[PDB]
C-alpha cells in the first residue's frame, strides 16, 4: 500500500474485534456502523462515513460491521434497522449514543465533538 493508496479507509471488523475494542482501553472516540449490502439507504451512509473518516484522520476510529455475517451480535445490540450508527465514547463511564436512519454529516460531527 506504499505506492498506491487505499480507496476505502473504513475496515470491516468482526464481532470479536468489537468486543475486544469495547473491553479494552481507547484514547479516541469509536463509531460502529451496521450495514448490509442489500439495504439501499446504506449506500449513502457509507459515503458520509467515508467523508467523516477523511475529516477525522486519526482523532477517531470508524469501523463497520456486516449484519449478514453477524446477525446475532447485531440483534443483541438492540439494532432495529439498517441505517444504525453506534457512537462509543472514549471514557468508559459515559453512555453510548445510538442513531437510526440517515442523519446529516453535521449531526455526526456535533455528536462526536460534544456528546462523546
Amino acid at each position: 500500500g506504499k505506492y498506491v493508496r487505499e480507496d476505502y479507509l473504513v475496515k470491516k471488523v468482526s464481532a470479536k474485534d468489537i468486543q475486544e475494542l469495547i473491553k479494552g482501553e481507547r484514547n479516541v472516540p469509536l463509531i460502529i456502523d451496521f450495514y448490509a449490502t442489500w439495504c439501499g439507504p446504506c449506500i449513502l451512509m457509507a459515503q458520509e462515513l467515508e467523508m467523516l473518516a477523511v475529516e477525522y484522520e486519526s482523532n477517531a476510529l470508524i469501523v463497520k460491521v456486516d449484519t449478514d455475517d453477524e446477525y446475532e451480535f447485531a440483534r443483541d445490540m438492540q439494532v432495529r434497522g439498517l441505517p444504525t450508527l453506534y457512537f462509543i465514547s472514549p471514557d468508559p463511564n459515559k453512555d453510548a449514543i445510538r442513531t437510526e436512519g440517515l442523519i446529516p454529516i453535521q449531526m455526526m460531527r456535533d455528536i462526536i465533538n460534544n456528546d462523546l
Binding site: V4, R5, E6, D7, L9, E50, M51, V54, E55, E57
Partner: protein
C-alpha cells in the same frame, strides 16, 4: 469483477492490454530466444529468463515531453557467458534496451510525441466451409483452413466426390495422397472417417500447420474434435474430419460459415503488437550477439557479457514502430472528447488487413453480431467507409481475442441475477429481449409477448422463453453517439455527422455546462485525462495557480497544474482550481477543472437563445445570423497557440551562428529581438516579422519569419540543446504565439443534433428579433432544415433548455426514454415548460394553442410576425475549422524546382489548381484565351511570366505566348531520355515550309 454494475473506464482496454503484455508477453518472448553458439569450441552465452526485472524510468513524463525524449523502462536480465578457455560461466546483468511505458490514459510518449495504438480486426484462424455456385451444374463447396501466418489449405469438391486440395497452382491434388503422406496407412483412414464409401469410391509445411491456440479451439468447435488445447498443430485427423464435413455438405448435412461474424474474427491489441516488436528486437539482438562474438574471436579476446549486448536493437525497433507503423498514430487533442474517442477505434485496414480498395461491400455493413459490441453509427467518411469503427461503451476484450458484451440473465436460479460478458458466438443461441415488462392482459405476466433476438433474427415470443435481457442504455452505442440527447428523434444518418462534428469543437476561454445532456459528460471528463484527480485523501492546505498542496496522513503531495499550454492541434490547455482551501478530498475526486470542462462535466460549447425563422435570406441554405452580444461579451472566444521552430543545423563547412545584428534588414523589424538572436517574451508580433535571427555562415540570413495570418503575443520561447544522439546535435529554438480568436463571419457553428452552419452576418441586438420578454435572440436558424435532414430532437432540446434556464435546472436524460411510455419526451418537455411559465410568470413560455411556439416581434420595424416561431436555448459548439485558417491568396511568389509550376499548400503561399474537370468546363464555355493564359503564363511559362509583371506595371497589352510551356519541354526531355522524339513541326500554309519549334 468490474464493469458489470457500472460504466467501465474508457481507457481500460489499453490499460489491461499493456498489463497483460508486461505480465506474460515479455517472458514468452524471452523464453523462445535461442542459445547463441557459433564457433568450433562452441562458446555459449545464455540469458537467464527467470531473472527478468524492469526498472523505473529515469526521467518523468513532464520532462520527456519538454526535452523531446522517450518515456521508457530499462530491461535488466542476468546473463551467463561460458568461455571456451575459461571452462566456466560468468554471470552478470546486462542492459538489453528500453521498453516504452504506457500512461494511465493509454497514451505513450516516444520522442516527446503522444501516440496511441489503434486496435485491428483480423480474421481468426480456422476452417471456413464456403460454397460457390458453378455456372452450369451443382454448386461447388470449398473448405479453407486459415493459419496464424496466413496459410490457405483449401479443399474442394466437384460434381463427383473429387476431394481435391487447392494448395497447388495446378488443376487439383489428391486428398488420399496427402493423407498417406501425413501418415495414414489408407486403412485406418477409411475406418475412422464417416461415409467411407464416398472416400474409397474416388480413385510452407510449418506455416500452414502453425495454428494458433485460437486456431486450435476454433477447429475443435466447428469440427467436433477432442484434441487437447495444447497440441496446436494441424493434425491429420483434423484434415480427415474436414474432408468428412466437406463431403457431408454435398448431401445437405452441413452449414456454411459466415465470414462476417465476429466469432470468426480476432482483435489485436497493443499487447499483440508490442509482443511482435519485442520478438523482432530479440532476433536483431541475437544477430548482433553472433556478430560481436565473431568479432571478438577475430580480435582474440574473451569479453564480458556486457561487451556483447548493445542497447541499439530494442530502442531502434520501438522507435521505428512508433514512428512508421500504420497502427501507431499521434493522439488528437483538439478537445477532451477526442483523446478518449481516439483510443476506442477498431480498424480493418492495416498491416495484414484489407486495404481500402480490397474491401468488399459485405465487409463494410453491420452484421447482427455487431450488436452491443461495435458502434453501428460511427464510421470513417470517405473511401474507407465501413472499415474504421469505434468500440461499444460496455464492451471488453476476451481471453480468446473476442469482444464481449454484458447480458443480464433473467432465468431463475440460486442467485437469480447475473451479468455475463457473453462472446459473440455464444449470444446467438439465446433469446435476448430488449423490451420492458409493463404489460398485463388478464393473464400471467410471463404469458406476454416481446420482440427478441435469436439465431441472428428478430421474432416475437413469450416472456417464459427469453433467457437474456439487455438492460444497459449505453450498451449499443459509443462515446460519440451517446453524447447526443434525444437520439431516438433523430435520423441514423445524421447521427454520424453529429458524432464527427462533436470531435471538432474548440475549447473556449470560458466554459459553461449544457442545460440538456445525456449524463455521460461526467465520465467523459473523468476519463479524458485533462482533469486533476487526487490520488490520496487529505486536506488542501495551500492553494496556488501553479501548484496545489494536499496534506494527508502526515504527508504533503504537490499536484502541478497546466497554465496555457499547447496541444497537437493548436488548441490551448488550461486548468483552474475547483476545491477551496481547507476541504477534504477523497482518492478520486476532482481537484481542478481543465479546459472545456466545468464542474467536472464535458463542456464543448455555450447555451444561447435561438429562434427558428427565415431572416432576409441570411439563413439561406445553412447559414446563421448571430448577434453582436456573442462578440462583445466573449461568448465564443478561444485561444489558439501555434509553434515555429528552426534548428541550428551545423554544416560541415560552417556552423550556424545566432546573432541579433543582421544587415540588409529594415529597422522596422528586429525590434522584438533580444541581445541574443531570439524574440522576447511578451512581444506582440505580426506577419513578416523576424522571430529568430541567424547569421548562418557556411553570410546569409536563414531566419524565422511569421507567415500570413500570424498575429499573436509571444508567450514563451525554448532553447533546447539536443543530446543523446551519439554526437553534438543542433540546438532547437521553439517560439509560441497565442492568437485570440473571436467569433466572426465565416466561422462554423454546430449543434449536437447534426445541425451545422456558417455565420453570415453579425447584426446588432437592436435589429435582432426579440421575444415578449424583451430579449433579443442570439442566433437565428433556418426552419427548413428539419424536414430535410430529419432532426426532430433539436426542437426538444431547445425547448427543454429554455425551460431550464428559467427554472435554473439541468437535465441529464438517458436515451430512449420512450421505453417507459409513449411520447415521454413530449410529456417531459411540455411539463417543464408549463412549470417555468407558472413559476416565473411568463405566460409566453407555454402557449396552450401552440405548445413550444411563441410569437416574437421584429427588431427593425417593431411589428409582430404572422406565425409563431420556436424559441429555445440549445447547446451550440464552435468548430475548429475557422475562416482565418482557410483564407489564402497568391499573386506571383514561388515556383517548383522541376515543374516550375506554382507551389502547393496554404502555408507555402501557393495558388489554386485548375484540374481536368475545370478545363472541360472552360472548353465548353468556349474561353480559349483564358485557358491558354492559365496553362502558360499564370502557371509555367517562365519568360511570359517574367514579362507579365513588367507589362502590367507599365500598362501595355500582354502578348499571346507562342513558345511551349515548361511542362511540354519536360516531356520532350523525358521521352528523349526514353529514346523517343517529339517535334512541333508547324507548316506554313503560305509557302509550304516546315519550321521546328524548340
Amino acid at each position: 469483477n468490474e464493469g458489470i454494475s457500472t460504466i467501465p473506464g474508457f481507457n481500460q482496454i489499453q490499460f489491461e492490454g499493456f498489463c497483460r503484455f508486461i505480465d506474460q508477453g515479455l517472458t514468452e518472448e524471452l523464453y523462445k530466444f535461442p542459445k547463441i553458439e557459433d564457433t568450433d569450441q562452441e562458446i555459449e552465452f545464455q540469458l537467464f529468463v527467470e531473472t527478468y526485472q524492469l526498472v523505473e524510468p529515469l526521467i518523468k513524463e513532464r520532462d520527456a515531453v519538454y526535452e523531446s525524449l522517450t518515456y521508457s523502462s530499462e530491461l535488466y536480465v542476468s546473463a551467463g557467458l561460458i568461455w571456451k578457455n575459461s571452462r566456466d560461466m560468468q554471470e552478470q546483468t546486462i542492459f538489453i534496451g528500453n521498453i516504452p511505458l504506457m500512461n494511465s490514459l493509454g497514451t505513450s510518449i516516444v520522442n516527446g510525441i503522444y501516440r496511441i495504438v489503434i486496435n485491428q480486426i483480423l480474421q481468426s484462424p480456422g476452417i471456413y466451409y464456403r460454397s460457390e455456385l458453378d455456372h452450369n451444374g451443382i454448386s461447388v463447396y470449398t473448405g479453407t483452413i486459415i493459419s496464424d501466418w496466413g496459410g490457405r489449405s483449401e479443399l474442394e469438391i466437384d460434381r463427383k466426390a473429387r476431394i481435391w486440395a487447392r494448395v497447388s497452382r495446378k488443376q487439383k491434388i489428391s486428398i488420399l495422397v496427402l493423407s498417406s503422406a501425413m501418415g495414414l496407412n489408407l486403412r485406418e483412414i477409411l475406418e475412422n472417417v464417416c461415409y467411407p464409401e464416398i472416400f474409397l469410391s474416388f480413385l510452407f509445411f510449418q506455416q500452414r500447420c502453425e495454428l494458433g491456440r485460437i486456431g486450435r479451439r476454433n477447429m475443435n468447435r466447428r469440427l467436433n474434435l477432442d484434441i487437447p488445447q495444447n497440441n496446436t498443430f494441424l493434425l491429420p485427423r483434423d484434415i480427415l474430419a474436414a474432408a468428412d464435413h466437406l463431403i457431408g455438405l454435398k448431401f445437405g448435412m452441413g452449414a456454411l460459415d459466415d465470414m462476417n461474424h465476429l466469432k470468426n474474427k480476432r482483435i489485436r491489441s497493443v499487447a499483440d503488437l508490442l509482443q511482435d516488436q519485442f520478438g523482432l528486437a530479440l532476433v536483431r539482438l541475437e544477430n548482433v550477439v553472433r556478430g560481436t562474438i565473431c568479432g571478438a574471436i577475430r580480435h582474440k579476446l574473451i569479453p564480458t557479457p556486457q561487451n556483447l549486448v548493445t542497447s541499439t536493437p530494442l530502442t531502434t525497433t520501438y522507435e521505428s514502430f512508433f514512428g512508421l507503423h500504420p497502427l501507431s498514430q499521434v493522439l488528437d487533442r483538439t478537445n477532451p472528447l477526442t483523446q478518449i474517442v481516439h483510443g476506442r477505434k477498431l480498424s480493418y485496414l492495416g498491416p495484414g488487413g484489407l486495404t481500402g480498395r480490397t474491401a468488399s461491400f459485405r465487409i463494410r455493413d453491420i452484421h447482427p453480431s455487431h450488436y452491443g459490441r461495435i458502434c453501428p453509427i460511427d464510421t470513417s467518411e470517405g473511401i474507407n467507409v465501413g472499415l474504421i469503427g469505434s468500440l461499444a461503451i460496455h464492451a471488453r476484450i476476451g481471453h480468446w481475442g473476442s469482444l464481449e458484451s454484458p447480458f443480464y440473465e433473467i432465468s431463475e436460479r440460486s442467485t437469480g441475477v447475473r451479468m455475463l460478458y457473453l462472446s459473440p458466438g455464444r449470444d446467438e443461441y439465446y433469446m435476448v429481449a430488449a423490451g420492458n415488462s409493463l404489460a398485463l392482459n388478464q393473464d400471467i405476466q410471463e404469458e406476454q409477448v416481446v420482440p427478441a433476438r435469436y439465431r441472428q433474427e428478430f421474432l416475437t415470443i413469450a416472456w417464459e422463453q427469453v433467457h437474456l435481457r439487455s438492460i444497459f442504455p449505453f450498451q449499443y452505442f459509443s462515446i460519440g453517439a451517446s453524447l447526443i440527447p434525444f437520439i431516438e428523434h433523430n435520423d441514423a444518418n445524421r447521427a454520424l455527422m453529429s458524432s464527427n462534428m462533436q470531435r471538432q469543437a474548440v475549447p473556449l476561454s470560458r466554459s459553461e455546462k449544457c442545460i440538456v445532456g445525456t449524463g455521460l459528460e461526467r465520465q467523459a471528463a473523468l476519463d479524458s485525462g485533462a482533469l486533476a484527480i487526487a490520488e490520496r485523501e487529505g486536506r488542501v492546505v495551500y492553494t496556488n495557480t501553479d501548484k496545489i498542496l494536499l496534506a494527508g496522513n502526515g504527508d504533503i503531495l504537490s499536484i502541478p497544474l497546466v497554465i496555457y499550454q499547447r496541444s497537437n492541434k493548436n488548441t490551448c490547455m488550461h486548468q483552474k482550481l475547483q476545491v477551496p482551501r481547507g476541504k477534504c478530498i477523497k482518492k478520486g475526486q476532482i481537484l481542478a477543472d481543465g479546459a472545456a470542462t466545468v464542474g467536472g462535466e464535458l463542456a464543448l460549447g455555450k447555451n444561447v437563445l435561438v429562434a427558428y425563422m427565415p431572416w432576409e435570406g441570411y439563413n439561406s441554405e445553412d447559414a446563421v445570423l448571430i448577434s453582436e452580444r456573442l462578440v462583445y461579451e466573449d461568448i465564443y472566444t478561444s485561444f489558439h497557440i501555434r509553434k515555429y521552430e528552426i534548428q541550428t543545423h551545423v554544416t560541415s563547412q560552417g556552423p550556424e551562428k545566432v546573432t541579433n545584428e543582421i544587415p540588409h534588414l529594415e529597422a522596422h523589424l528586429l525590434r522584438n529581438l533580444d541581445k541574443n538572436g531570439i524574440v522576447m517574451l511578451g512581444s506582440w508580433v505580426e506577419t513578416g516579422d523576424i522571430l529568430v535571427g541567424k547569421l548562418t555562415p557556411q553570410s546569409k540570413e536563414t531566419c524565422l519569419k511569421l507567415p500570413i495570418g500570424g498575429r499573436g503575443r509571444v508567450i514563451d520561447v525554448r532553447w533546447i540543446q539536443k543530446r543523446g544522439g551519439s554526437s553534438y546535435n543542433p540546438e532547437t529554438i521553439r517560439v509560441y504565439i497565442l492568437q485570440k480568436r473571436e467569433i466572426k463571419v465565416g466561422d462554423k457553428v454546430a449543434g449536437r443534433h447534426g445541425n451545422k452552419g456558417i455565420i453570415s452576418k453579425i447584426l446588432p441586438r437592436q435589429d435582432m428579433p426579440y421575444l415578449q420578454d424583451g430579449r433579443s435572440v442570439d442566433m437565428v436558424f433556418n426552419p427548413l432544415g428539419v424536414p430535410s435532414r430529419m432532426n426532430v430532437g433539436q426542437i426538444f432540446e431547445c425547448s427543454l433548455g429554455l425551460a431550464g434556464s428559467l427554472l435554473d435546472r439541468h437535465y441529464r436524460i438517458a436515451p430512449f426514454d420512450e421505453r417507459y411510455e409513449q411520447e415521454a419526451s413530449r410529456k417531459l418537455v411540455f411539463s417543464e415548460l408549463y412549470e417555468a411559465s407558472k413559476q416565473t410568470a411568463n405566460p409566453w413560455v407555454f402557449e396552450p394553442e401552440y405548445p413550444g411556439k411563441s410569437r416574437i416581434f421584429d427588431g427593425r420595424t417593431g411589428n409582430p410576425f404572422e406565425q409563431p416561431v420556436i424559441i429555445g436555448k440549445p447547446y451550440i459548439l464552435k468548430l475548429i475549422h475557422q475562416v482565418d485558417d482557410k483564407i489564402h491568396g497568391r499573386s506571383s511568389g514561388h515556383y517548383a524546382l522541376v515543374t516550375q509550376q506554382p507551389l502547393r499548400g496554404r502555408a507555402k503561399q501557393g495558388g489554386q489548381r485548375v484540374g481536368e474537370m475545370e478545363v472541360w468546363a472552360l472548353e465548353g464555355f468556349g474561353v480559349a484565351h483564358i485557358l491558354q493564359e492559365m496553362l502558360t503564363y499564370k502557371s509555367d511559362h517562365i519568360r511570359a511570366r517574367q514579362e507579365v509583371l513588367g507589362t502590367t506595371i507599365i500598362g501595355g497589352t500582354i502578348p499571346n505566348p507562342e513558345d511551349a510551356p515548361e511542362s511540354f519541354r519536360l516531356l520532350v526531355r523525358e521521352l528523349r531520355s526514353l529514346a523517343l522524339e517529339l517535334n512541333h513541326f508547324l507548316v506554313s500554309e503560305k509557302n509550304f515550309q516546315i519550321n521546328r519549334k524548340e
